[PDB]
Symmetry: D2
Subunit: 237 residues, 4 copies
């Protein structure tokens, strides 16, 4: 199976598999059952921003999700990613719907990673910024239902001609280049990701969520990972 | 008196005022008696690098100091800087010598601060990088004994024609522009500073150290702050 | 006597002082009589973007001004800034109104300059970015009628409580820190500035314009430089 | 058939194919016969820096190559890359040796491109920086004889165990992700690249050179392109 580290913006409470009983953001370390969560006042139809940060000094993965003029939600978990992920990874965005649905629209996405070597104190870095997605976005790998180009946005899951989101959908976008996320011979390692999103649903409850994730380079959507599995894991273990 | 937050690279143990009994790095919150320290294998005559980071998600000020091919020293302290510093500040470097001495040479210094507003999710940012200091460096405010231009370096404390460091010296350099370090209406605030340094001493023990500091805008060297006070505080309270 | 290099967004044709007979963008080298202009279809009450670039390899100062979904206007001029500007400068935005008026509203402003030295091949850099301006913005020097804070914007010229621009006004905002824009011992020097602006004339008869400028560090608004002089020059020579 | 735009650091005069009779830097547009060259005083065994710049406002591709404490060599050429390159490309470094040889060692390589769209005035950006290359560098596509890891450097052409360069060699390194270098609906597009290199000929008779290049995404080393062809072209036309 793939190795997955993710920050989930989980719009639907699946209490049967350990979700808390409210929309929430979570830190996922090789399991969809978040190691840490925080309650998230998700706002149906509004544009929100997610900010995710990690550095190898504190060894702490944190995320903040917010909407304009509202209190933000924050969640943090102590984790040495050297012991979790492979040295080289891809980074990506994932989303899904199930029996309930929502749009999982990405308006923008940026990422920066840096590695300062122990032997020279010089840095390696990667940065990308997408404020517009085009129809044939060659620096992204799209998987499953994800498409680009509609209003210059990345639609992670399926939306119809008129704008209605569809159920039982799953899709992901990964940045084309592998990222060197840790190195044993590095004095300081760090990364941050930011993305803006629009989750809209005509349903009685929205579902299922969006995740920023870091995985083995050849990661692909596990079969049967629509709904509560967020396109990230093959099961709820 | 001035309000001071600093990370000290303390080369001399003044156990009489609470220093541990070895060279150390420390986090100083309105006192020269560090809230937290870590032992620091300081290397006489070698170029080292200091990295300092803070973000308002974790509310944690950390620093890592290292030399090439050696284990680094790291120190962290939880502190909500909103409750410590004024909203606007200057940032700077300070150093001193006392009855023992050392060069306090800065080879390079960079800094980046960012503020993401709560109402718009757009960012304000400041970044500077100095890899060379010139004789008349108008974007720096020099205080006390600090000079620029000699081999393109910033000499924080007094050095003679031939290279010998002098005792009872104190000097500082602050970036000219005020920095907006926190804002109540900001969703995420963060900063980082990096500097490379060369501390060399002909003495039986080097003294006294170098600090990166953040202070009220009109901060100036308190009188009698040579030696153990690092050009930062008017006394050892 | 001030030394000014500027890019003007000139909304009002003063044909008696050499303006072309339509709204225009221009490159001003020590004179309001632009060395080069281009026709500019300004859009009353719409947000526009101006981007300015120079490097010491091509020694060509270029600017592009545009509105979403319209054709840009571009102007360039070969000039060796080493021979025009002092080595250290301040950078700023300026605007004015005279018998006729307009809002001279700045929504965002960013700037980056870099100098790479001949001897070490390392870089000094300054970067700032304002997407929000606050009431008491300590890293800006405001002059004349310029104010910050209203709607998070910089209003360079006078606007009343009910939103209407006033005539006979002039105002400027300069970045607090001096900038080292050229150095004879540097291998490559470059800068760029970007700002977004909202120029609105409720009568559809706007004047006088907005400029990005670079000046001697101690530059102040010249006597009488409301109207056609854009807050930049003491006369129309 | 590959489409190549490149800046060559040509260490060996092939006067039978249009090289000038001295070592030179050149701008190559779909041909090894540079559209513009400049004399280059290469310094055997010293670390040099090459800097390359282009923006869509001036549409001028310029390069500067220098060594510490020497006069730079500069070359520029007006070219509308929109009409030469495909919209998506890869960027790379390339080098070769033929009857004569030299080390074609790369110590660091950085690249940034930005595209600002006509419709929203927002930017897409890619930036990478390598100051250290590692043995198994997954964000580089290496071709031919190019290797990474030795002393943290990229060796583009063959070097033996005892440090001597080999003849008849060719190698390239391309950044893994495709780059969107132009887009007809963008208001401003720009890129820049910088690399540092160490070209050493133990006999003081070096060949053949190093290039920074931009190519169709699926570009491979053309058949026979060791020697004068720099790993870039299938013939000398
Ligand atoms: Ca769920
Ligand atoms: Ca001490
Ligand atoms: Ca005019
Ligand atoms: Ca040749
Ligand atoms: Mn969950
Ligand atoms: Mn101490
Ligand atoms: Mn004019
Ligand atoms: Mn040639």
């Amino acid at each position: 199976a793939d190795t997955i580290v993710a920050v989930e913006l989980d719009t639907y409470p699946n209490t049967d598999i350990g979700d808390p009983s409210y929309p929430h953001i979570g830190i996922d370390i090789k399991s969809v059952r978040s190691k840490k969560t925080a309650k998230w006042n998700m706002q149906n139809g509004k544009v929100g921003t997610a900010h995710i940060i990690y550095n190898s000094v504190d060894k702490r993965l944190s995320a903040v999700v917010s909407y304009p003029n509202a209190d933000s939600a924050t969640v943090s978990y102590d984790v040495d990613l050297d012991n979790v992920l492979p040295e080289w990874v891809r980074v990506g965005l994932s989303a899904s719907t199930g029996l309930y649905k929502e749009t999982n629209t990405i308006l923008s996405w940026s990422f920066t990673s840096k590695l300062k070597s122990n032997s020279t104190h010089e840095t390696n870095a990667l940065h990308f910024m997408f404020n517009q997605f085009s129809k044939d976005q060659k620096d992204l790998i799209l998987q499953g239902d994800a498409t680009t180009g509609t209003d210059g946005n990345l639609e992670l899951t399926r939306v119809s001609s008129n704008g209605s989101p569809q159920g039982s959908s799953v899709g992901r976008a990964l940045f084309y280049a592998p990222v060197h996320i840790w190195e044993s011979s590095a004095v300081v390692a760090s990364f941050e990701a930011t993305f803006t999103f629009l989750i809209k649903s005509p349903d009685s409850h929205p579902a299922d969520g969006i995740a920023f994730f870091i995985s083995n380079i050849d990661s692909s959507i596990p079969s049967g990972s629509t709904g509560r599995l967020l396109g990230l894991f093959p099961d709820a273990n």
